[PDB]
Design an enzyme around this catalytic site. Structure first.
Site, PDB file in Angstrom:
ATOM      1  CD  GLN E  11      45.619   5.156  70.519  1.00 40.00           C
ATOM      2  OE1 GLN E  11      45.204   4.109  70.024  1.00 40.00           O
ATOM      3  NE2 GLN E  11      46.894   5.343  70.834  1.00 40.00           N
ATOM      4  CD  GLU E  64      43.005  -0.647  74.190  1.00 41.91           C
ATOM      5  OE1 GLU E  64      43.631   0.357  73.794  1.00 41.91           O
ATOM      6  OE2 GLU E  64      43.161  -1.784  73.699  1.00 41.91           O
ATOM      7  N   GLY E 137      36.803   0.655  65.841  1.00 38.55           N
ATOM      8  CA  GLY E 137      35.628   0.086  66.469  1.00 38.55           C
ATOM      9  C   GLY E 137      34.987   0.993  67.497  1.00 38.55           C
ATOM     10  CB  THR E 172      46.922   2.279  60.988  1.00 38.28           C
ATOM     11  OG1 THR E 172      45.584   2.581  61.400  1.00 38.28           O
ATOM     12  CG2 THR E 172      47.686   3.576  60.778  1.00 38.28           C
ATOM     13  CG  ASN E 221      47.051  15.158  67.092  1.00 34.28           C
ATOM     14  OD1 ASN E 221      46.258  14.639  66.307  1.00 34.28           O
ATOM     15  ND2 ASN E 221      47.923  14.451  67.800  1.00 34.28           N
ATOM     16  CD  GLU E 247      24.331  34.322  62.216  1.00 34.27           C
ATOM     17  OE1 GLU E 247      24.487  34.373  60.979  1.00 34.27           O
ATOM     18  OE2 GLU E 247      23.392  34.889  62.810  1.00 34.27           O
TER      19      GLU E 247
END
Ligand SMILES: Nc1nc2c(ncn2[C@@H]2O[C@H](COP(=O)(O)OP(=O)(O)OP(=O)(O)O)[C@@H](O)[C@H]2O)c(=O)[nH]1
Ligand SMILES: Nc1nc2c(ncn2[C@@H]2O[C@H](COP(=O)(O)OP(=O)(O)O)[C@@H](O)[C@H]2O)c(=O)[nH]1
Ligand SMILES: Nc1nc2c(ncn2[C@@H]2O[C@H](COP(=O)(O)OP(=O)(O)O)[C@@H](O)[C@H]2O)c(=O)[nH]1
Ligand SMILES: Nc1nc2c(ncn2[C@@H]2O[C@H](COP(=O)(O)OP(=O)(O)O)[C@@H](O)[C@H]2O)c(=O)[nH]1
Ligand SMILES: [Mg+2]
Lengths: 49, 42, 58, 430, 432, 430, 430
Positions: E11, E64, E137, E172, E221, E247
């Site tokens: 995720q 998922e 995981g 979390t 993000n 490089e």
């Protein structure tokens, strides 16, 4: 169930019609304005008898 | 109008059966040739 | 007496309409691209960005 | 996919289940005739987790109603939203159990159990990829506390791998309904400790305290307590049924909440809960939500969390919110109340976010906490049980139905061992 | 003629990857449906369908369906090839054993089938890009499996891993130290370069520069995608000093063991209505070297620098960089190891950074992206070792891993691999 | 020069009119004998708006007093300033309405309105250029609600372009003294929305609320309540009678407060209001006035404006001050309370300045606000109507004069539509 | 101009505050009628700090008075200087607390504080720039300790950046006048450590001791004691109102005097104090002033500082003097008594000079000290707490109205931890 969904689908597709046009005294004033403004010229149009 | 397997929203609502899977994105209209063309040298 | 469970705790206040209830953050934030005339005036861009962020938050 | 079946047992279980299915149907926009009435398309996105497709588009729940008395089924069917359930899943006896753990676990269970196993295995083979089982019952009665735990043990036997969680309404001493509550409650605890993967305890006293204090309603009924339980219980699968920033299914919760395999008893709470005459003002932000979450009186158990140390905690946020604030608030709570958290488990709070808030609310939070305070509720039951076993009265009915005092002796010893090893980790230091 | 393939797992990788592909289409004029409205730079990240639309060179992996179908139902459903959105059945649930020995082997075969189907189409591969959050995981378990398998399938091919290590104090999950330790051993020798991308530093930049008190995963993000866009901008746009992927890791890696990076970006300008400022090259470079401005919670003043790679995009003149670099060296708070007299490599690209309409950043004519190797990076490994110390001492949560294909051993050498790694940084940084 | 005429009906209307003319007379320096007593010439520059010219240098108000029972007119004559009114303007009936809407609207109102309509027609012709009409009546009484609303219908028919303003007093459920008030209140409301350009709601409950707490006088009387309304009534039309930095008449306020013609129900408030023992302690400044202006408890309606959204608002400052205090504060109050103002009409507040303060005051503010929170008092009234109508209680009196139940049905639908229209515009986003 | 607001609660706060406003009004030359009749222009330059000007030219203090009974508010109104306080600033109940902490903090305090919080909120935003708050109350009583500490919590969550001071009258066992002091003394202390930025404890026995020995007054009264406390209060904010050589405001005191967040309890003193019959027989010089202000028997607390080591002290000189003596004397007393100052902090004394001394005096000094010797007050209170809490005596009143023994344990535990850490640095070495 099929008829229920037919009825709901046909009835649910109509909604976005608002167009606020409430006119109770505003319409009366609006008609009065048209009448005076349009009929002044017609009053200054009639031929004598 | 997305009732069960009636009208296109997503494959989860489609859950098509019987013959195939329904058209999803747009597809070309009827008989477009798929793939890189070839046989040109000028 | 009222039969059955007859619950009335009314966890939700209700009577509140949330037109954007089912708009996910992952969906909405990444794909607006609304208006944003390619103008070179920084003030216009800033005002448009503030309005866009207000609409997104609300 | 990753679906979960529901089996409710006993009067308490059926009362929980009726309101739970009403709540789920309201959330997913389903009428009591199984006809879809949702507005968004995300409502049918994961409906298959709890519902099945029937001819014509009707949806039916995967609930199994089972008990020994027909008085519960014919009332829950006559009540509202009773048409969803299939009559094939309606299974019940005719002689009752008389709130006798031995009777409902030994005598009439042995032959009635075949039908319920047949129907549950039919449902399990029907579902594509099973995820877990959920069962609602109470330990104060006989038919529930016995038959439900027997069913739980054997369904674990044929499904040793799939997770399985149950909700338990443990009897309370200040408001006692049956004279034999310690006996069957101790038996159910002994039979459930090694079978249930997750167990959630609910105290009826705590529900009364909450409804009296924060709801400020003078006349509560069994409907309101069932409503609180149903809301807190449906808040768990929120990220499993809807998309979110950090989805965390039941398996994810199991890994992060249980440190040792024999410690899987939890207390839950829900927030926010406003009064009925609440004025229309402001909006619920994170700090008040987490303050009311960690409020001790908000817990649904008579055990006081401040009496022990939290092994770990879990929060399920509902609504549209950012991620930084929840983490910094959890860190703030830990730094403020480090005395209530064991120190060899750094950052012992898990956070999850679901993007679909409960209908009619802007924000909501569900709390699941594994705290060392449950030793008190075990201790008080044990003290009652030993006093009521030394008398050797009401023992002849239990012993005259195939069992004897050996099971009681080994059960009290095992439950005492649970308390001892449970306090061992509370007193352990880093 | 030059192509790069990006792999997203977990995720954390999927969500950060969604921002990147939003950014890339804007740069090359690709509409969300993939159809050009109204050259050949897009060939680095896209493949022509033959007539019309384009397809990104990416494959999505997760156990998922919740995230994958969201992409398949979002506004970018029109873009991706339907089989590169690999979806699983059951999640690992923050269990490394499940993602490595239980349910990862039924999907890794499908991925490598799709992996080869994209490599043969292209001809001039430079390297692979893989995104993942290490504190999970399936994110770490599948990532470790993919790197190990791709190591023997391709061999000398370059690989870039932009992992997201857990924050020093905020998190979390509760068992995320277990996954991080196990996966680090796997990627200690299977990836060519990796970068530190912990969450706290990105929070600090958003709170300070952007002055945003409401930062979420969407903002983080977007910042990461900007680093990626600047990082590969030399491959698809003409620049004064072109620098390639090969490089990079031949210049930033003194010894094969030490290949962990950290990033910084500047300037970060909010979308306000002020006149702003020209932001000369000399001052944007100073902000890039600020210890608080680093995108990782690492204090460079706590260690010595080994090598530094800086990218300038805009209208930067080589003389301005040379003057700016000289001034930085004279500053006392920044020092280098004695056996590395020269430690700067610079790349200049003419194409200015683009701005996402509706985003937080504003339009600027100058920008700098920094990737550096420093001795101070040893501090993050030490703190997770201490965190994992209090964990394994009483053997908590271990039985979950043991019962799912893991035995008691692997926690042992995982300790020693980091202990050996930590000692390596200590001995490299010592004076000759 | 754009003068307005005054019409008052009913017992409540007469008492409001009786005290209102006292305030205006004192403001313009007119003694009880109708002779000028003022000091400055500004008090005579615009005297023609309210007072006609008579022989001998005396002035007479152009106010028409109407009632269905002459006892009210005997009382209004014996009060102070009772000799100003011209004896011809009194038009009265000799039967009475008896708290019956039907009697005052079909039998007695119809037969008597011929005389009063002639008087008001005569007054309108005398002026060079009429500006509008203002009405003061109670909607709970018989003659005030019954015949008062029918005169509005007749006047609107013959004078379309002119504006009409109504200071209407509706009964509140808390202080209730008439059993049959729900019937005649809702019937008038349907008629009022059809023709009236502006309506201003007044509640005896709110007037009592202000007196007990703000002014802190132990035993208020009806004279005190009439004084508060009269102060607000004169304030709204102040700038039309005196110069100022910014002009505004009744038409200007109507344009800037009515987005849709069906939404013409406002609420009013007056500031400052201080107790006798607290005038020495408060500093009179514009920030102080603005703070009290938007105070929720300062309104003269039972509706709480924090439960809805201000669609539009207007402020009329009376006194000498700079525009900076005005302009800055209205901007400030809009920014700090952005949640209480609807979003799709930015800058929805209007400011006006008049440089003539009242006697004994250096600054004063009259506030008129259009809010969607006013719908809740209509709901409460309609709640009591439907409770009584289903059993057809007290109906034979209403059916005894030819009026049929379809008008009762018509009243419910139109009232509900008005309530729904307020709700729709409150819950709207761009 | 960085003005401060004053809140006074309980019987002590009302009596201390009333005496306080007498001194300030005398210092600023304001008569009891509120009209300025001062002498020098310096008295108006910063009069806005403590007073608000109303229209008409009279100055009114910005103070809020709190009590659950009208017993003490009527007397202060009828007493001298009682006309200064604005009548809208008096808020009170009608039941009283009865020396019960929970009554003033849970049942009656909660319902009443809604009104007073509005008064404080209006007062705060009315002024330009806040500087902080100062509180005068008692901890051994019901309404002062109960409601008082609740408002500290309430205002803290609304103004997190502003400073806040307390002048707390903690009880001493020698003057035993209440049998329930240990219960509500600990509870108030527990709540006071997370919110108050500066605390200054005061004891009656110490005040009585000073009057008997220093002033040599044969029989004192609360009037005398209230004046000594008021003298120290005005001396703290001396540099905030008058020009000086080294200005120091409230924030500058906290920075220099608070090394650690939980170490903010101080002990204060005043100098010079001289008997009436021996004033002219001694000289007023800086060496004399500094000698008395370090005297162990001159401070307002019964604790002997010679039983501990100072962490930091502050001296606020007033009047005309030379800075050389001020700096030299501080260094001199810091060297000859090096055993009484903790070594790991150099130059732990701060000095400040203000040119305007109190009326009728040439020089004066206010001493504020932070020493470990204040643990004796908390140690002795805790000893009495556990001696009475052991038998659960006098407990049912608290627990009968929503109080639980859990937070009695929490309050005692935290205060005991505060004692342990506060004297930890006494034994600490570099
Ligand atoms: N920057 C950023 N990090 C994320 C985001 N989502 C998740 N993470 C990181 O992912 C870590 C935890 O991993 P998960 O969210 O469980 O994802 P995963 O590793 O694939 O594990 P699964 O949930 O089983 O799929 C957290 O510590 C976050 O730092 C995101 O949207 N942005
Ligand atoms: N919270 C809650 N408790 C219930 C409900 N119904 C029964 N109980 C409790 O369950 C106890 C009796 O359980 P019992 O009926 O003997 O369980 P059974 O034998 O399995 O049916 C009583 O003390 C009740 O307080 C319910 O709907 N909600
Ligand atoms: N505000 C105010 N209300 C009044 C006054 N006089 C009467 N009322 C209210 O009017 C109501 C009775 O109305 P009523 O006299 O029957 O109206 P009418 O039939 O039109 O004359 C009572 O409930 C009073 O509260 C007044 O002078 N001022
Ligand atoms: N120094 C001083 N102490 C006072 C005064 N009034 C009361 N006290 C002390 O306060 C204590 C009683 O507190 P109390 O008034 O009952 O607190 P409350 O009930 O919360 O207001 C007694 O021990 C007195 O010694 C005063 O005017 N000056
Ligand atoms: Mg996941």
């Amino acid at each position: 169930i099929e008829q229920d969904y037919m009825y709901r689908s046909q009835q649910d597709s109509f909604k976005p019609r608002l167009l606020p046009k409430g006119n109770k005294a505003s319409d009366l004033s609006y008609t009065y304005t048209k009448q005076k403004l349009s009929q002044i010229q017609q009053n200054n149009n009639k031929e004598l008898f | 109008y997305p009732w069960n397997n009636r009208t296109q929203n997503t494959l989860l609502l489609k859950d098509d059966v019987g013959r195939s899977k329904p058209s999803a994105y747009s597809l070309p209209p009827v008989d477009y040739t798929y793939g890189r063309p070839l046989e040109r040298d000028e | 007496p009222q039969f059955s469970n007859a619950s009335q705790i009314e966890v939700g206040d209700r009577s509140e309409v949330n037109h954007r209830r089912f708009v996910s953050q992952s969906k909405n934030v990444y794909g607006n691209f609304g208006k944003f005339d390619p103008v070179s005036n920084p003030g216009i861009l800033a005002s448009k960005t503030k309005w866009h962020h207000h609409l997104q938050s609300k | 996919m990753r679906e979960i079946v529901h089996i409710q047992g006993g009067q308490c279980g059926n009362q929980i289940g009726a309101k739970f299915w009403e709540v789920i149907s309201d959330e997913h926009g389903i009428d009591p005739t199984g006809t879809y009435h949702g507005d968004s398309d995300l409502q049918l996105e994961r409906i298959n987790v709890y519902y099945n497709e029937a001819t014509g588009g009707r949806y039916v729940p995967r609930a199994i109603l089972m008990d020994l008395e027909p008085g519960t089924m014919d009332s829950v069917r006559a009540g509202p939203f009773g048409q969803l359930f299939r009559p094939d899943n309606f299974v019940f006896g005719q002689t009752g159990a008389g709130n006798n753990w031995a009777k409902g676990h030994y005598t009439e269970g042995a032959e009635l159990i075949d039908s319920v196993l047949d129907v549950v295995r039919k449902e399990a083979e029907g579902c594509d990829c099973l995820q877990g089982f959920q069962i609602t019952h109470s330990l104060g009665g006989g038919t529930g506390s016995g038959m439900g735990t027997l069913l739980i043990s054997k369904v674990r036997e044929e499904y040793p791998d799939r997770i399985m969680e149950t909700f338990s309404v443990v009897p309370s001493p200040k408001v006692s309904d049956t004279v034999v509550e310690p006996y069957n409650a101790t038996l159910s605890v002994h039979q459930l400790v090694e079978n249930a993967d997750e167990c959630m305890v609910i105290d009826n006293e705590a529900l009364y305290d909450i409804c009296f204090r924060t709801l400020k309603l003078t006349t509560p009924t069994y409907g309101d307590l069932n409503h609180l339980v149903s809301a807190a219980m449906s808040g768990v699968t929120c990220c499993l049924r809807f998309p979110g920033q950090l989805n965390s299914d039941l398996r994810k919760l199991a890994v992060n909440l249980i440190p040792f395999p024999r410690l899987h008893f939890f207390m839950i709470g829900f927030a926010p809960l406003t009064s009925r005459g609440s004025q229309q003002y402001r909006a619920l932000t994170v700090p008040e939500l987490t303050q009311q979450m960690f409020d001790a009186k908000n817990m649904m158990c008579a055990a006081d969390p401040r009496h022990g140390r939290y092994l770990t905690a879990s929060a399920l946020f509902r609504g549209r919110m950012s991620t930084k604030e929840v983490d910094e608030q959890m860190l703030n709570v830990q730094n403020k109340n480090s005395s209530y958290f064991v120190e060899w488990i750094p950052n012992n709070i898990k956070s999850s976010i679901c993007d679909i808030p409960p209908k009619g609310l802007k924000m909501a939070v569900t709390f699941v906490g594994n705290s060392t305070a449950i030793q008190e509720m075990f201790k008080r039951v044990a003290e009652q049980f030993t006093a009521m076993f030394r008398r050797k009265a009401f023992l002849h009915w239990y012993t005259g139905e195939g069992m004897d005092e050996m099971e009681f002796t080994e059960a009290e010893s095992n439950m005492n061992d649970l308390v001892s090893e449970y306090q061992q980790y509370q007193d352990a230091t880093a | 003629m030059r192509e790069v393939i990006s792999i997203h797992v977990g995720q954390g990788g999927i969500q950060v990857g969604n921002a990147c592909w939003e950014l890339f289409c804007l740069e090359h004029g690709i509409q969300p449906d993939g159809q050009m409205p109204s050259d050949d730079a897009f060939n680095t990240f896209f493949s022509e369908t033959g007539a019309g639309k384009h397809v990104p060179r990416a494959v999505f992996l997760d156990l998922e369906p919740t995230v994958i179908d969201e992409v398949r139902t979002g506004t970018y459903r029109q873009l991706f090839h339907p089989e590169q959105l690999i979806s699983g059945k059951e999640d690992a649930a923050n269990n490394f054993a499940r993602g490595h020995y239980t349910i990862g082997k039924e999907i890794v075969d499908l991925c490598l089938d799709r992996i080869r189907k994209l490599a043969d189409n292209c001809t001039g591969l430079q390297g692979f890009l893989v995104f993942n959050s290490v504190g999970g995981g399936t994110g770490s378990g599948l990532g470790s499996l993919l790197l190990e398998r791709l190591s023997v399938d391709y061999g000398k091919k370059s690989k870039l891993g932009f992992t997201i290590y857990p924050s020093p104090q905020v998190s979390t999950a509760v068992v995320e130290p277990y996954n991080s330790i196990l996966s680090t051993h796997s990627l200690l020798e299977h990836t060519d370069v990796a970068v530190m991308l912990d969450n706290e530093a990105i929070y600090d930049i958003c709170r300070r520069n952007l002055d945003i008190e409401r930062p979420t995963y969407t903002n983080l993000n977007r910042l990461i995608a900007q680093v990626i866009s600047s990082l590969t901008a030399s491959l698809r746009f003409d620049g004064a000093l072109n620098v390639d992927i090969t490089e990079f890791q031949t210049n930033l890696v003194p010894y094969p063991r030490i290949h962990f990076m950290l990033s910084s970006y500047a300037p970060i300008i909010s979308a306000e209505k002020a006149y702003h400022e020209q932001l000369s090259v000399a001052e944007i470079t100073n902000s890039a070297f600020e210890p608080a401005n680093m995108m990782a919670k690492c204090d460079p003043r706590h260690g010595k620098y080994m090598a530094c790679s800086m990218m300038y995009r805009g209208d930067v003149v080589p003389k301005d960089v040379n003057a700016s670099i000289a001034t930085i060296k004279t500053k006392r708070t920044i020092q280098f190891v004695d056996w590395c007299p020269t430690g700067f490599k610079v790349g200049i690209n003419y194409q200015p950074p683009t701005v996402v309409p509706g985003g937080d950043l504003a339009k600027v004519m100058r920008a700098v992206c920094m990737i550096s190797n420093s001795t101070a990076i040893a501090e993050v490994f030490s703190r997770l070792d201490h965190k994992f110390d209090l964990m394994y001492a009483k053997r908590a949560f271990v039985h979950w891993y043991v019962g799912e294909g893991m035995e008691e051993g692997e926690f042992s050498e995982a300790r020693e691999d980091l202990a050996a790694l930590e000692k390596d940084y200590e001995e490299v940084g010592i004076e000759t």
